[PDB]
Write a protein that binds this ligand. Structure first.
Ligand code: CLA
Ligand code: CLA
Ligand code: CLA
Ligand code: CLA
Ligand code: CLA
Ligand code: CLA
Ligand code: CLA
Ligand code: CLA
Ligand SMILES: CC1=CCCC(C)(C)[C@H]1/C=C/C(C)=C/C=C/C(C)=C/C=C/C=C(C)/C=C/C=C(C)/C=C/C1=C(C)CCCC1(C)C
Ligand SMILES: CC1=CCCC(C)(C)[C@H]1/C=C/C(C)=C/C=C/C(C)=C/C=C/C=C(C)/C=C/C=C(C)/C=C/C1=C(C)CCCC1(C)C
Ligand SMILES: CC1=C(C/C=C(\C)CCC[C@H](C)CCC[C@H](C)CCCC(C)C)C(=O)c2ccccc2C1=O
Lengths: 107, 139, 80, 34, 90, 732, 161, 30
């Protein structure tokens, strides 16, 4: 499955640059990006991000530019929902680009 | 005061959510309460049961299950007549709640404060100060 | 068991005592605050470590503090 | 190979009997009250 | 957590004054500020001369010029000691 | 009920959590019940002897298995054509095609080919036969026994050192600088002069003849006269055939620079003079501190006196002496940071300046050695920051550190953390923006609109070292210059010959692809540093948990109140920085390996054009070089790359299994496990068997650690299979 | 030239880039009739490609061995139009945006409901602010020296440590 | 080449090292 399906048939997405299918090559890479970016929200916890936001808020207080809507790390549930949304968007997008460039070139 | 073992249990058809071997070899909890009606409630361990008019008695595995049911009876059926016991396999029955006849959220004389620390939380000792020492971090 | 402490910033609001699912906390008399009462932790052997008491506490930093410790059947929440 | 019989003797022992025995005795040690 | 040992002869060297106490000079605590200043210039000139004489390095360098070239960094420490002694009244 | 004998809290846990937690806390002796400071230092001393013995047993095992089953003598005859053998294979699961496919190396049994370089190292330092490899393995077995016995001995009541011994900083520094560093460097200079260099010139020297064979014809007479330069006379000729007498000189300490023309390695006489000069410098360094005779420095006095009078550092280093001496975690953090920098120097200087003969023609060994030592470097650097966080939580006393450098660091920790945040974002936005720029604009058929920045600063540094490739005439590159004229009589000719041949890896040519990957490496470094520094400086407290130090280093959370506090401990910042360390070492080793396989093929222009967008990295490096690896077995047969082809899939599996521990959390699994406990108790013939430990789901911190281990192991195994098999399959 | 690079106008690899880019469009144009919309579209793309290559050749850009322009960013004035001047333009715009956003957050603090001014923006006042940013360097430095940009360390909340 | 007797000498010394490792491990364990 790795060699004869994913590796062999990803030839069209990765060789698509400079053709009419170059949009699929770009979406292949962009969806790989979004999928990986989702793991930042899925493997992480809210407490780290609230403590990081504290130092960023400090730098805003120093310049007297802190917002009146106090920044918070996303909720625990929202960190999970954002991770899941970007995971599905990236994985489905990677397959969408792979399937369409492959079958448009060969079928 | 002691649990009258003969109190009739609320009608229930059984479930898999009840207590397991640890109840018959480590400890079991019991709850009794008075109902003015023969009415349906929800068991903490599963589906629905019917509490009988008069005195009811249940057996559960965890203290939190007895208190989750107690919270429910008080909130919906306004039953504040609930007494929670711990039962050991030796036959010893241990009264648990309310521990001195008065609910914990109401003050009572003769209660001695346990766990109370004379300073605020920021005045504790640093871990390095009490390293290789038995002294407690609460001052 | 878990270790539960009450610091003398307690305003005697009784909210921790009402929120505790395992009847660990209760109110005792105390002249320090306006309410005339402070929270107490006489039954920490029953503490499961849920930290609902800490959620209920309204003082700026928690007057009630749970310190998770050695695990037992009671504090692990095991019905088996 | 010199002493060519050694791998066919030691590899089953190191790979099967040695872990089987350390698992058996570690299991006894971690499950004893005293 | 336990007493940390130091070699015998350890003394306190923390300073918040204009110059450190002369104890920070070790064996040179009694040398005058003029003597460090003259040693500072002497070591700088001799060290620079010896360094200059062997800048194209060969397989046969004069060992006295190599050893004398170490007087240049030593002169930096000498003028620091001269400032310390002048500001301690020595 | 008694496995964690060092922890009564765990030995009374009735769940399976007791076994896991007892195994994971075993080496954290400071937290074990009833641990005094005496006993902590004495157990650490004995287990340091045990670690040394493990290192000597590992080295003896490599020498023994090469002596027994290897082809060292055949490789020694013809080192560029023979492939070195690590050890033999005896696997009763093999099929007969697998037995045949692994029967390479010129031997009659299936075998593994060594990627460690031990053949080139042992050849360069003198080993010539199997019998002196076997002699070295028996010596290391003896040394392992000696250090196991010394570890046992110094746990005996009369031989247990006191804390006053363990905290003697000045005597330990004097001995480790002048004896452990300096004298053993001097002794290694002796080995090269007495054994390695003579056998590099055809003359055997061993214990049977080394007292009657002079390293130099004149012989210890120029040394005792000051005629030291007589030892540099007649160096090895450029016609020298390593291991033989043809073209050989008589020098022992000559400085020539550059590479031996046939081995493509540094001259052995340069290496011998290096270790002699290092030995002298380090022996001198080891007389700095006062021990018993009234000369030397007190470390306490030096630290106390270095407070800048302008007051910008506060009290300076007053009280740092006691803080470092009493904290083993502070010492560990300093040691690991220093070690991490060195193993990165080892990785960088061993590919650019190889010292072993005929290595750097072993492209597999060169790639594996670089990758190996960079991953070791990343682990050591993460550990240094982790033990600095453990120091602040556990060993730092703010009252013995009033207005120190340490206290003032904590006093401006938001300035530090926010400026790391800014520089990480600054690097990230624009490095990724330029990469995505070039990707998008190359995709539309317009590669001439790419943003291609010439790395002129690094090219100017290369030219300052004499590289005449970019036409910068500054410093050494100019024929006339004080820098160029000063080194002309010594190393400058051989260094210019080495740096201006395009046949090595000394200051490799760089372009826009190297500029972009360098900025990506800078982004990765600053972000890993951010996470680790933020963990160390927020370890004691923050605004969510102002009392975080009361809970320790590794605790799950503070609960769902105050908005939620998952991953709030300093341990969780180690956990989060481990992903970024893996990512940065990935970017570094991907860059090293792609640049080198394109150079080794003769197609450096493929890296030059494809490295400036990310599709070039995806198809021309990962996809293009995967094909020999994933064809190690197929429906048409198998070859000797079948094992890496399996490890590759193995690595993909473990990595993904890590996701299960990292994405799904405890409550789901505890509820499943309760339905399994019910089913076991209700199933006949099965409820006859009972657990002694109540099955529970893994803990929150434990699950983070298990997912991290699975992720990391999959990362290492997948890349190791790729970097070894693709380089093997290509040979270029 | 600089760093062994070649001016793009005399690079042979740049010329092969231009020729290959035009042959690729001409072979797509070889499949259409003269007045068709795909023919006009591809002829306009060939004009755009030739114009771009001509402009790059005469601009003083330096090409590499690959025939692509390379940017020199060390600070030399003969190449300031590749990073230094685009960078000056960026910093003027970015400092404008920052100065204008800061002026609005300080205005919104003095409002009846300060947090309602940030989800419902007072558009006339915010436009008064966006116009002020054209002299942000002088306004912001005078703000700095008059002690109104930087707040002292003791009016900033920090962690207990 | 290595004789089998030479291998047996190596196995003896590794056995002695195993005995010393057990004794050190027991001393560390207390
Ligand atoms: C760390 C050292 C080390 C390692 C990893 C290996 C690895 C291997 N050896 Mg071993 N070997 C070593 C040292 C080592 N050797 C030494 C020093 C000797 C000389 C006594 C031998 C003698 C030897 C023989 C005679 C044979 C092997 C064989 C093998 C292979 C199969 C495993 C086996 O049968 O082991 C059996 C190994 C031994 C009985 C020797 C003792 C192993 C060392 C001394 C102990 C190392 C312990 C380590 C430090 C701590 C481990 C515990 C860990 C959980 C912390 C495998 C490649 C077999 C082979 O070639 O199959 C193809 C085989 O027949 N080896
Ligand atoms: C930057 C480095 C540095 C600095 C500033 C000093 C400075 C000093 N050293 Mg040290 N020393 C150094 C490096 C340094 N040393 C090194 C590398 C070594 C190893 C060879 C020594 C070994 C050394 C010894 C053995 C002794 C000194 C002593 C001294 C003091 C003598 C001053 C003098 O000669 O007055 C005129 C002075 C404070 C002496 C002293 O009194 O120390 C307190 C002393 O006994 N030094
Ligand atoms: C001259 C005397 C001397 C010597 C040789 C040593 C030697 C050592 N001591 Mg020390 N020690 C001494 C005196 C001495 N001690 C004194 C006087 C005291 C009391 C004040 C102590 C107190 C002491 C303690 C408390 C401890 C030690 C420890 C150690 C060991 C350190 C670990 C190790 O192997 O590092 C080896 C290090 C090197 C070989 C040099 C470092 C090399 C650097 C990192 C780079 C090298 C790069 C180079 C290219 C290497 C190439 C490798 C090759 C494959 C190409 C080491 C054997 C520790 C130990 O392990 O105990 C068993 C320990 O816990 N010592
Ligand atoms: C591909 C995966 C990926 C990416 C891109 C990032 C990116 C980032 N991480 Mg994360 N992270 C990841 C995986 C990833 N991480 C994983 C797997 C882990 C392990 C759990 C972590 C753990 C982690 C920690 C613990 C930390 C970071 C930090 C950072 C920042 C470091 C780089 C930086 O400062 O500026 C780079 C900035 C960017 C890459 C942003 C991209 C610009 C975007 C795409 C603009 C596009 C706007 C566009 C119009 C939006 C369209 C939306 C549509 C609906 C209209 C950055 C936000 C650190 C941080 O935030 O410090 C400041 C930090 O502390 N990350
Ligand atoms: C914080 C940002 C940052 C960081 C961490 C690095 C880090 C690095 N750079 Mg990069 N670089 C940067 C910004 C940065 N650079 C910028 C803005 C430029 C100009 C386009 C360059 C141009 C550049 C070149 C040409 C080269 C490197 C190289 C390198 C590496 C070696 C060290 C070096 O030369 O530093 C360079 C450090 C600086 C130039 C200092 C920048 C610090 C300021 C604060 C950043 C912001 C400046 C600002 C945007 C411009 C002011 C306005 C101006 C337009 C009027 C290292 C990976 C070299 C390398 O090895 O490449 C392979 C190399 O050859 N860099
Ligand atoms: C490759 C990654 C991977 C793997 C192997 C698994 C494996 C599993 N998951 Mg997990 N999971 C993953 C990723 C993965 N997951 C991710 C990313 C998520 C994120 C949302 C989850 C979320 C998740 C949930 C929420 C659930 C699972 C469940 C399951 C189980 C399914 C039952 C099963 O197949 O048993 C068979 C086991 C396997 C197929 C594992 C591989 C074993 C193979 C056959 C080889 C065995 C070799 C042998 C043991 C070697 C012995 C010797 C050796 C010890 C030396 C199984 C334990 C479900 C579960 O536990 O219910 C049963 C479940 O409810 N997973
Ligand atoms: C279902 C698809 C799938 C999935 C999920 C994986 C998963 C994995 N693969 Mg596999 N792989 C697959 C399909 C897949 N592979 C196929 C079809 C092939 C072709 C046969 C391969 C070939 C392959 C190779 C050859 C390699 C992997 C690696 C990896 C691992 C990446 C680990 C990580 O965190 O990334 C971290 C990611 C990076 C460090 C870089 C990402 C790769 C980019 C494209 C190149 C680098 C760009 C540049 C350096 C950085 C730009 C900086 C930025 C500022 C713009 C992981 C185990 C790699 C590995 O083990 O990593 C150590 C590895 O070497 N895989
Ligand atoms: C105009 C308002 C404003 C101002 C003056 C600043 C100023 C600063 N920010 Mg902040 N920031 C803002 C908005 C603002 N920020 C917003 C909305 C976000 C959320 C995305 C952030 C997120 C953020 C982070 C995460 C970090 C900073 C940092 C910084 C500092 C360095 C500059 C920098 O890194 O910019 C970076 C700017 C961004 C990453 C996002 C800016 C997004 C837009 C362009 C700005 C908002 C425009 C706003 C809608 C104005 C409308 C005006 C109108 C109503 C009249 C500096 C204190 C860094 C720091 O602390 O370093 C010391 C840092 O780590 N900021
Ligand atoms: C991780 C670890 C744990 C605890 C702490 C720790 C100790 C510091 C650390 C160390 C671990 C370490 C250092 C572990 C070290 C482990 C070692 C060195 C194991 C060696 C085993 C060798 C064997 C069994 C060979 C036996 C040969 C025989 C019987 C041959 C005999 C013979 C033949 C045929 C021929 C001759 C005659 C006879 C005699 C008949
Ligand atoms: C987290 C934490 C909490 C508190 C405790 C803790 C453990 C201490 C801490 C950990 C901190 C940690 C982990 C800190 C890690 C710190 C590290 C990794 C510091 C790296 C330092 C490298 C330097 C200064 C290189 C200098 C090179 C130079 C000057 C070369 C110069 C040059 C020469 C000679 C030759 C070439 C030309 C030029 C370039 C001119
Ligand atoms: C990065 C991160 C944050 C911080 C993330 C934040 C603050 C989101 C940043 C959004 C900024 C403010 C705007 C940028 C939005 C994008 C440009 C596009 C968003 C598209 C939709 C929001 C409309 C968490 O709060 C968190 C919580 C729990 C687990 C993991 C994480 C986690 O990984």
């Amino acid at each position: 499955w790795l060699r004869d399906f994913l590796w062999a048939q990803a030839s069209q997405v990765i060789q698509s640059y400079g053709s009419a299918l170059s949009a699929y090559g770009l979406i292949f890479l962009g969806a790989h990006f979004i999928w990986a970016f989702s793991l930042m929200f899925l493997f992480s916890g809210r407490g780290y991000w609230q403590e990081l936001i504290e130092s960023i808020v400090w730098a805003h207080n120093k310049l007297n530019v802190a917002p009146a809507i106090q920044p918070r790390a996303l909720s625990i549930t929202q960190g999970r929902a954002v991770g899941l949304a970007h995971y599905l968007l990236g994985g489905i997008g990677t397959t969408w680009a792979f399937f369409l460039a492959r079958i448009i070139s060969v079928g | 005061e002691t649990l009258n073992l003969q109190i009739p249990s609320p009608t229930f058809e059984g479930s898999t959510g009840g207590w397991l071997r640890a109840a018959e070899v480590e400890e079991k909890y019991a709850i009794t309460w008075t109902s003015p009606k023969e009415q349906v409630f929800e068991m903490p361990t599963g589906g629905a049961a019917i509490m009988r008019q008069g005195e009811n008695l249940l057996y559960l595995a965890r203290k939190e299950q007895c208190l989750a049911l107690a919270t429910q009876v008080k909130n919906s059926f306004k039953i504040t007549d609930y007494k929670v016991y711990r039962i050991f396999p030796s036959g010893e029955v241990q009264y648990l709640h309310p521990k001195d006849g008065v609910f914990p959220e109401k003050v009572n004389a003769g209660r001695v404060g346990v766990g109370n620390v004379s300073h605020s939380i920021g005045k504790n000792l640093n871990p390095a100060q009490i390293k290789f020492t038995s002294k407690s971090f609460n001052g | 068991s878990h270790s539960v402490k009450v610091y003398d910033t307690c305003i005697g609001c009784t909210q921790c005592v009402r929120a505790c699912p395992c009847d660990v906390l209760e109110m005792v008399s105390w002249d320090g605050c306006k309410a005339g009462q402070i929270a107490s932790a006489p039954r920490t052997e029953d503490c499961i470590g849920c930290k609902r008491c800490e959620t209920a506490c309204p003082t700026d930093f928690l007057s009630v503090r749970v310190y998770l410790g050695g695990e037992t059947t009671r504090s692990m929440g095991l019905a088996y | 190979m010199t002493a060519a019989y050694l791998p066919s003797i030691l590899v089953p022992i190191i790979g099967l009997i040695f872990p089987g025995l350390v698992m058996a005795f570690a299991f006894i040690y971690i499950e004893q009250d005293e | 957590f336990s007493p940390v040992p130091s070699p015998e002869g350890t003394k306190e060297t923390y300073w918040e004054t204009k110059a450190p106490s002369s104890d920070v000079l070790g064996i040179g605590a009694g040398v005058s500020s003029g003597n460090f200043a003259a040693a500072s210039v002497f070591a700088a000139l001799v060290g620079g001369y010896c360094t200059g004489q062997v800048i194209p390095l060969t397989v046969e360098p004069n060992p006295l010029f190599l050893a004398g070239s170490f007087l240049l960094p030593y002169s930096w420490a000498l003028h620091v000691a001269a400032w310390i002694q002048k500001n301690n009244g020595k | 009920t008694k496995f964690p004998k060092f922890s009564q809290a765990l030995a009374q846990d009735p769940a399976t959590r007791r076994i896991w937690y007892g195994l994971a806390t075993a080496h954290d002796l400071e937290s074990h019940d009833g641990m005094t400071e005496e006993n902590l230092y004495q157990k650490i001393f004995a287990s340091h002897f045990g670690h040394l013995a493990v290192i000597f047993l590992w080295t003896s095992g490599n020498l023994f298995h090469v002596a027994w089953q290897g082809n060292f003598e055949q490789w020694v005859l013809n080192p560029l054509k023979v492939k070195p053998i690590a050890h033999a294979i005896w696997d009763p699961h093999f099929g007969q095609p697998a037995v045949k496919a692994f029967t390479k190396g010129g031997v009659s049994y299936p075998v593994n080919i060594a990627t460690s370089g031990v053949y080139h190292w042992w050849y360069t330092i003198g080993m010539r036969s199997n019998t002196d490899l076997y002699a070295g393995s028996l010596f290391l077995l003896f040394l392992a026994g000696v250090f196991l016995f010394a570890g046992w001995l110094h746990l005996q009541p009369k031989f247990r050192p006191g804390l006053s011994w363990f905290k003697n900083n000045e005597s330990r520094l004097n001995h480790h600088l002048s004896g452990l560093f300096g004298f053993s460097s001097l002794a290694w200079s002796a080995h090269l002069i007495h054994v390695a260099i003579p056998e590099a010139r055809g003359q055997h020297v061993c214990w049977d003849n080394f007292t009657k064979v002079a390293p130099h014809p004149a012989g210890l007479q120029p040394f005792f006269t000051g005629n030291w330069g007589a030892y540099a006379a007649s160096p090895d000729t450029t016609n020298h055939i390593f291991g033989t007498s043809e073209g050989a000189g008589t020098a022992i300490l000559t400085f020539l620079g550059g590479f031996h023309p046939q081995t493509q390695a540094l001259w052995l006489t340069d290496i011998a003079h290096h270790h002699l000069a290092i030995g002298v410098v380090f022996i001198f360094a080891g007389h700095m501190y006062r021990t018993n005779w009234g000369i030397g420095h007190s470390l306490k006095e030096i630290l106390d006196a270095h407070r800048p009078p302008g007051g910008r550092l506060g009290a300076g280093h007053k009280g740092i002496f006691e803080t470092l001496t009493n904290s083993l975690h502070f010492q560990l953090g300093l040691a690991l940071a220093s070690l991490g920098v060195i193993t990165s120097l080892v990785a960088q200087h061993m590919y650019a300046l190889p010292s072993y003969a005929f290595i750097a023609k072993d492209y597999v060994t060169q790639s594996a050695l670089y990758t190996h030592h960079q991953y070791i470097a990343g682990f050591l650097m993460v550990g240094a920051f982790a033990h600095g966080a453990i120091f602040f939580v556990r060993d730092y006393d703010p009252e013995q550190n009033k207005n120190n450098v340490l206290a003032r660091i904590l006093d401006h920790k938001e300035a530090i953390i926010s400026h790391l945040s800014w520089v990480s974002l600054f690097l990230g936005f624009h490095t990724l923006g330029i990469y995505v720029h070039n990707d998008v604009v190359v995709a539309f058929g317009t590669p001439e609109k790419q943003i291609l920045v010439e790395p002129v600063f690094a090219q100017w540094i290369q030219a300052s070292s004499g590289k005449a490739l970019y036409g910068f005439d500054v410093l050494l590159s100019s024929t006339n210059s004080v820098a160029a004229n000063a080194s002309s009589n010594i190393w400058l000719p051989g260094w210019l010959e080495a740096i201006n041949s395009g046949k090595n890896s000394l200051f490799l040519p760089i372009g826009p692809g190297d500029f972009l990957i360098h900025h990506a490496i800078a982004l990765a470094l600053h972000t890993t540093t951010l996470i680790l520094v933020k963990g160390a400086l927020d370890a004691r407290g923050s605004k969510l948990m102002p009392d975080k130090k009361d809970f320790g280093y590794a605790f799950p959370c503070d609960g769902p109140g105050r908005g939620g506090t998952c991953d709030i401990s300093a341990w969780d910042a180690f956990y989060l920085s481990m992903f970024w360390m893996l990512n940065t070492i990935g970017w570094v080793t991907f860059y090293w390996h792609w640049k080198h396989i394109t150079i080794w093929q003769g197609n450096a222009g493929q890296f030059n054009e494809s490295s400036t967008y990310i599709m070039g990295w995806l198809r021309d490096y990962l996809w293009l070089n995967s094909s020999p690896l994933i064809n190690g077995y197929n429906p048409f047969g198998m070859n000797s790359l079948s094992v890496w082809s399996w490890m590759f899939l193995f690595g993909h599996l473990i990595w993904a299994t890590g996701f299960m521990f990292l994405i799904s959390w405890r409550g789901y699994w505890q509820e499943l496990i309760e339905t399994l406990v019910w089913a076991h108790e209700r199933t006949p013939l099965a409820n006859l068997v009972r657990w002694k430990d109540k099955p529970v789901a893994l803990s929150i911190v434990q699950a983070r650690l298990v997912g991290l281990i699975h992720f990391t192991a999959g990362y290492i195994f997948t890349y190791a299979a790729f970097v070894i098999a693709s380089t093997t399959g290509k040979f270029g | 030239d600089v760093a062994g690079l070649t001016p793009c106008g005399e690079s042979k690899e740049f010329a092969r880039r231009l020729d290959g880019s035009v042959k690729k469009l001409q072979t797509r144009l070889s499949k259409y009739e003269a007045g068709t919309p795909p023919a006009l579209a591809l002829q306009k793309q060939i004009d755009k490609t030739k114009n771009r290559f001509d402009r790059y050749g005469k601009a003083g850009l330096l090409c590499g061995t690959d025939g692509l322009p390379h940017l020199i960013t060390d600070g030399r004035w003969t190449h300031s139009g590749e990073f230094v001047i685009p960078g000056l333009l960026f910093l003027y715009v970015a400092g404008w945006i920052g100065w204008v956003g800061r002026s609005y957050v300080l205005f919104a603090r003095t409002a009846d409901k300060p947090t309602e001014k940030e989800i419902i923006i007072d558009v006339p006042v915010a436009l008064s602010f966006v116009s002020t940013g054209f002299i942000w360097p002088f306004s912001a430095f005078k703000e700095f020296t008059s002690g109104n940009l930087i707040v002292p360390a003791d009016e900033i909340t920090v962690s207990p440590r | 080449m290595i004789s089998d007797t030479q291998i047996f000498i190596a196995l003896i010394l590794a056995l002695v090292s195993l005995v010393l490792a057990i004794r050190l491990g027991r001393a560390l364990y207390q």
